[PDB]
RNA sequence: ACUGCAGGGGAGACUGGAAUUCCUGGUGUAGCGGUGGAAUGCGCAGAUAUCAGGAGGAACACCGGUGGCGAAGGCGGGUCUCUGGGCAGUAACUGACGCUGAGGAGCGAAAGCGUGGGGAGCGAACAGGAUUAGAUACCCUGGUAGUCCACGCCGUAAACGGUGGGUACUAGGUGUGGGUUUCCUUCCUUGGGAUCCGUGCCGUAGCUAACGCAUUAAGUACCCCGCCUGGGGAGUACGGCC
């Protein structure tokens, strides 16, 4: 437990999950991963009500150490990752750096198959 | 369609090739 | 006698102490092998887009030497051995 | 580098030899042969030891310079090429400008006449032997010591082949063939490049003799001896054994190691 | 390299005059050039299969103004095959 | 539409900010299009940004 | 031949990095991951996540397109050595030396095969779970061979424009690529126009069973080559070559 001048958000979105964790901007972790902890399963825990109680409770271990301003990093295409950024809104900390960092690798990697409906 | 003309051939192939892989052995390599 | 721009990076700190020496150490080489040497026109030094697994800032070395292509591909050699030397690009000059 | 021989006899299908391309026609210097004789597998109380050792063919021995020492900023030049016995590499005649015969596992295709430098003050062109310390992280060696002035002891075959991952505060991350990792000091010294006569891999030994002429005896399998000599032994109807594979003395296939080596403060890294 | 100054060189040698670049004698002699530097570089690298067709129909150039040539006059090719040797 | 009477003087990667304005904020590539450009010219200015990258004159991605 | 121009044309060597996976360490924890839904599985031995650092293989976003080059298959991360081909103008040279081309020789994606390396991710086979009456298939997990590299073999496919090559000629227009050159000669436009190649569209005639083609003809017309002559049995058998 300690005092947080300012945190570092991350948020990752999916098409069948989503996390909210705030670290140090030093590079540790602060605020456990949120989402899950709401007893929803399969495509349930996608949804951006999920993400408004993953936000919540992101502003409650928040306020366990002591924080009013946080940066925004977020990726990972999902539910409405909006959900998310107006519930920490509602939980009223500084956006500070609202900038996605949305990964956009260069073409590597083959994907892999799930083209079959 | 037009396609049919290309099916008949299909199946005709593929009978051939799976008689030979059922003998691409003594079965077959003996004679 | 393949006119060349020949790029070099490093700390600038580097450049201020050596700022002839280690660059006449290879450059007479060349001549040596009967060159032609240009310039050694640095532009300060300049921070880098991304960091070279350290030196955020370098320097923007500017060579241009109108040598033959084995002298030259000797002169990459050395240099790329010699830890000072980063990400050195050697461009034609035509066609 | 190979030629394949000729089906002729039954013995010789496939089988296999370096053109030895490399090799001049040279003969080897008396001033560095050694001699030296088969002692089968025996060791001093005549008892045998290793069980393959016996026979071969009368074979002498070359005065390898791997303490090396004289390259206080002096060359030398390769004269000869030449053949040698007892190892899988050939090896290199260099004359000192000091004048100095000395034998060296060669790396690449050196010829007569290509300067060799060393020392601390060399560049690393193939061939040159200097520390650790002083060479860039991310190429290959040879013939690297693992104690300073303790002798090349690791890469010494063909196709062996060490690379630098880095440098420790005083130590120095190598990747050994294997795939281990081996933190050593750095003031040990190295050859660098590669034993460039990677073909012995390739070469099919064909007739028994061959085998028997280099120094190699037959191995006989444990399962058809009788059980007395060996734990897999006995049985009619040509069995395997009765538990697992050891040894003929009762020793499991697993890891020898001894645990509490005085090495596991230099390996990271283990292989496959 | 097949620069100006070989062209010239083997103009000067093979060929007639200065101003001769319809000479089948000297359009064969700078083809032969061409194989000798494109074949050199052929003994190098050889997966460039496409500059390799490029010296396949040089050769079929080469070959066809030779028989021209045996329709022409037979001191010329002789004299030329005497410089060359084919095969 | 550019490059008409400014056929004197070269680009390559001595001008950081003029290429500036052809790229994205990212520093993506901008199409012919967009200035107005002629093919030899684009396909020169794709060899000069990816060599001021490779140089760190310029990110892969001013994130 | 000369001069200029474009070009992912090819090989070889060197080589940067986003990113993914793995690993070391730190943080911090009970869910992750996955779907149509769900499971299998992963994770309590600290997974996932997140910071830093390190290894390694693969592919090379943006430019990039309706576009370029190549005989074609095909080829676009960068630098560099080597190297092929093509186009315009010039018309310096020869003076029919042209075209095609059976048989023949050579190049020839991916898959596959030999020997040997490499092997991140992916991923036949395979395994398990889900679905289904059943599902050796789809779906999900994990995952071998393989994909990659060195040197070799097989020589197939929509290897397709389902259009052999060359040659000459015949309404136009619109777009585009390369280059040359005129009027407007700065009206700046680097426009319009002429000309040669290449490219994509629409379109007159003509042709075509129709669909459609149409200065890149599937039109007029010559030369050469190649192939069929109902569908199946069959591009298989016997034979022979590789």
Redesign the interface.
């Known amino acids: 437990k300690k005092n947080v001048p300012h945190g570092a958000a991350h948020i990752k979105s999916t098409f069948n999950n989503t996390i909210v964790t705030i670290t140090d901007p030093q590079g540790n972790v602060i605020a456990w991963a949120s989402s899950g902890h709401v007893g929803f399963k399969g495509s349930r825990k996608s949804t951006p009500f999920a993400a408004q109680l993953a936000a919540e409770n992101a502003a409650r271990k928040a306020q366990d150490h002591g924080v009013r301003k946080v940066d925004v990093f977020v990726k990972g295409p999902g539910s409405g990752r909006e959900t998310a950024i107006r519930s920490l809104q509602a939980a009223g900390l500084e956006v500070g750096a609202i900038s996605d960092v949305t990964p956009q690798p260069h073409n590597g990697v083959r994907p892999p198959k799930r083209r079959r409906v | 369609g037009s396609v049919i003309k290309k099916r008949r051939k299909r199946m005709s192939k593929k009978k051939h090739r799976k008689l030979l892989r059922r003998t691409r052995v003594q079965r077959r390599k003996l004679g | 006698m393949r006119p060349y721009e020949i ?1 070099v ?1 490093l700390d600038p700190t580097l450049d201020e102490r050596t700022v002839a020496p280690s660059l006449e150490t290879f450059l007479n080489v060349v001549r040596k092998d009967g060159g032609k040497v240009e310039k050694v026109d640095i532009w300060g030094k ?1 921070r ?3 960091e ?1 697994a350290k030196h955020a800032e ?1 320097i923007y070395v500017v060579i241009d030497v109108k040598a033959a292509p084995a002298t030259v591909s000797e002169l990459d050699r ?1 240099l790329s ?1 010699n ?1 000072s030397v980063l ?1 050195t ?1 050697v ?1 034609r000059t035509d066609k | 580098a190979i030629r394949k021989y000729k089906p002729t006899t039954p013995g010789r299908r496939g089988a296999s030899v370096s053109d030895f391309a490399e090799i001049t026609r040279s003969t080897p210097e008396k001033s560095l042969v050694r001699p030296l004789h088969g002692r089968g597998g025996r060791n001093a109380h005549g008892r045998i030891t290793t069980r393959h050792k016996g026979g071969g063919h009368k074979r002498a021995y070359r005065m390898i310079d791997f303490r090396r020492n004289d390259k206080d900023g002096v060359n030398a030049k390769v004269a000869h090429i030449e053949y040698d016995p007892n190892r899988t590499a050939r090896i290199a005649l260099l004359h000192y400008l000091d004048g100095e015969k000395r034998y060296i596992i060669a790396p690449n295709g050196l010829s007569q006449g290509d300067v060799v430098e060393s020392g601390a003050n060399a ?2 062109k193939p061939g040159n032997n200097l520390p650790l310390r002083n060479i ?1 992280a991310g190429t290959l060696i040879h013939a690297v010591e693992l104690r300073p002035g303790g002798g090349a002891k690791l890469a010494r075959s063909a196709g062996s082949s060490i690379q630098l991952l880095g440098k420790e505060a005083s130590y120095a991350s190598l990747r050994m063939p294997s795939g281990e990792i081996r933190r050593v000091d750095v003031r040990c010294r190295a050859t660098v490049g590669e034993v460039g006569n990677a073909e012995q891999a390739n070469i099919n030994w064909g007739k028994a003799g061959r085998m028997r002429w280099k120094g190699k005896r037959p191995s006989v399998r444990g399962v058809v001896m009788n059980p007395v000599d060996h734990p897999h032994g006995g049985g009619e109807g040509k069995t395997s054994g009765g538990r697992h594979p050891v040894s003929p003395w009762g020793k499991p296939e697993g890891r020898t190691r001894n645990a509490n080596k005085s090495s596991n403060k230099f390996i990271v890294r283990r292989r496959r | 390299a097949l620069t100006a100054e070989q062209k010239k060189e083997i103009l000067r040698s093979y060929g007639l005059h200065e101003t001769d670049t319809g000479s089948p004698e000297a359009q064969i002699a700078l083809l032969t050039k061409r194989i000798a530097d494109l074949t050199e570089h052929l003994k190098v690298h050889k997966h460039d299969h496409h500059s390799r067709r490029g010296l396949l129909l040089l050769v079929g150039r080469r070959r066809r103004l030779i028989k021209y040539i045996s329709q022409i006059d037979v001191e010329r090719y002789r004299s030329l095959i005497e410089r060359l040797g084919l095969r | 539409c550019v490059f008409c009477a400014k056929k004197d003087q070269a680009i390559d990667y001595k001008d950081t900010a003029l290429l500036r304005t052809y790229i994205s904020e990212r520093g993506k590539i901008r199409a012919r299009r967009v200035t107005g450009n002629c093919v030899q010219h684009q396909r020169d200015i794709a060899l000069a940004v990816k ?1 001021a ?8 991605t ?1 994130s």
């Open positions: 790029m990076i300049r880098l887009a991304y070279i370098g050395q051995l830890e990400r690009k461009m | 560049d690393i860039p | 060599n990258r490779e140089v760190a004159l310029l990110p892969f001013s």
